[PDB]
Design a binder for this molecule. Structure first.
Ligand code: HEM
Ligand SMILES: CC[C@H]1OC(=O)[C@H](C)[C@@H](O)[C@H](C)[C@@H](O)[C@@H](C)C[C@@H](C)C(=O)[C@H](C)[C@@H](O)[C@H]1C
Length: 403
């Protein structure tokens, strides 16, 4: 009768109740978004199956007869910039995906991540010393946002260039508004230009950073990264290396602030902080939806998805599927969070999980341990949520440091 429109307010206002209504009617249903027809998967079993079914491609660069592949996430991106945004593991199918991921894994290791633990502790300490001891402060602008950025910039050796402006480009990209399509494509071109200069700069002056190491990495069978592969990987690692963590920290702070019972338990038992981060991810997944393209007709949950269809897997909705997580709408730092889809599932499983968990744990521990009277600076129902199916988050969050 009525095909949902992902641009309506139903998907940005108490939107989880809207997901629950669709899932109950059909975990796989037709929808409209950005002017195109698509399928939305809101069931946990359906979502898991989808992400595991390789007939559902992750590569937007592939050409098929008489069809125009259009991933929403690239709204307003010129052809060349899109290619720069999509020649990396997250936008590649095996066997290309397999080799790109292996070459990067050789340098982006748990070892390199763990070695940054002290640095992350220090950056976190410094940002907190600067907020003061009292009054109202935007915890996002003064903490949640800068922390992940400083960490990713040091990992990739980013210093010069618009080190404070790319944050501005990244923001416009997180929103997909048909109106601001041109401004979105222009910001994307700016990030590309920025990466090209960075890579060229690093080739000229090597260091011990992750970028320098990827430029030299090579395997006997797999070989090495091409100039374009190298550029695109740097680009995504830079953007995805911090945006999602900013969401994790902001949303995590908000959640603990509105659930004293859960916060008390964390302050009491510190060894329980790791699972709290996991529940924060399950409750409100930053990457609410992930995109796939049907290279062949595929059946999901008894529903035949026609070949050449765009498929939107609602990771966020799946994490709220009652059949998988009982009392889904309840934030519980003590619940079993195994199987959530916030880090993905299958061959594209999120490579930054170790870094993300590190940043989340260190940040929330330092924040609440430094301010025992920390409280929200505004009414809970007045917090403004980012309008993005791509990456959910809180852009502004007033907190009272001394209660
Ligand atoms: C709270 C933080 C994070 C969340 C929730 C998150 C979530 C995800 C998800 C859902 C996927 C799979 C997407 C798909 O299947 O298409 C993914 C993939 C990936 N993530 Fe993360 N991520 C986070 C942080 C990071 C960080 C810190 C980095 C990098 C420093 C990173 C790098 C990647 C990469 C490279 C992939 C592509 C993996 C592949 O295609 O093989 N992520 N992430
Ligand atoms: C503009 C489109 C791109 O988005 C972004 O880079 C966003 C800023 C990130 O927050 C995304 C959402 C990530 O956090 C991860 C979930 C997925 C990421 C690692 C990919 O590989 C994926 C192909 C991605 O690059 C694109 C969707």
């Amino acid at each position: 009768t009525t095909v949902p429109d992902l641009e309506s307010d139903s998907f940005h206002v108490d939107w989880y109740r809207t997901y629950a209504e669709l899932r109950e009617t059909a975990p796989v249903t037709p929808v409209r978004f950005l002017g195109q027809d698509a399928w939305l998967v809101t069931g946990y079993d359906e979502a898991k199956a989808a992400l595991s079914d390789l007939r559902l491609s992750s590569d937007p660069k592939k050409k098929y007869p008489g069809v125009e592949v259009e991933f929403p996430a690239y709204l307003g991106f010129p052809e060349d910039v899109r290619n720069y945004f999509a020649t990396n593991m997250g936008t590649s199918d095996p066997p290309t995906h397999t080799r790109l991921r292996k070459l990067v894994s050789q340098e982006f290791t748990v070892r390199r991540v763990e070695a940054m633990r002290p640095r992350v502790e220090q950056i976190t300490a410094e940002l907190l010393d600067e907020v003061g001891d009292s009054g109202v402060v935007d915890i996002v602008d003064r903490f949640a946002h800068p922390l992940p950025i400083k960490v990713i910039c040091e990992l990739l050796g980013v210093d010069e260039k618009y080190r404070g402006e790319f944050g501005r480009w990244s923001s416009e990209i997180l929103v997909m508004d048909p109106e601001r399509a041109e401004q979105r494509g222009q910001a994307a071109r700016e990030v590309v230009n920025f990466i090209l200069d960075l890579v060229e700069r690093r080739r000229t002056e090597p260091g011990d950073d992750l970028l320098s190491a990827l430029i030299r990495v090579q395997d006997d069978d797999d070989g090495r990264l091409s100039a374009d592969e190298l550029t695109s990987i740097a680009l995504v690692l830079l953007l995805a290396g911090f945006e999602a963590s900013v969401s994790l920290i902001g949303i995590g702070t908000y959640l603990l602030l509105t659930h004293p019972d859960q916060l008390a338990l964390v302050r009491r038992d510190p060894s329980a902080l790791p699972n709290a981060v996991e529940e924060i991810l399950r409750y409100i997944a930053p990457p609410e939806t992930t995109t796939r393209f049907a290279a062949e007709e595929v059946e999901i949950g008894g529903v035949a998805i026609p070949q050449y269809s765009t498929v939107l897997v609602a990771n966020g909705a799946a994490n709220r599927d009652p059949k998988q997580f009982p009392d889904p709408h309840r934030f519980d730092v003590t619940r079993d969070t195994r199987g959530h889809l916030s880090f993905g599932q299958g061959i594209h499983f999120c490579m930054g999980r170790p870094l993300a968990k590190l940043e989340g744990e260190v940040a929330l521990r330092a924040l609440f341990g430094r301010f025992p009277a920390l409280s929200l600076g505004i009414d809970a129902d007045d917090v403004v949520w980012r309008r993005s199916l791509l990456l959910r988050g809180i852009d502004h969050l007033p907190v009272r440091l001394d209660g």
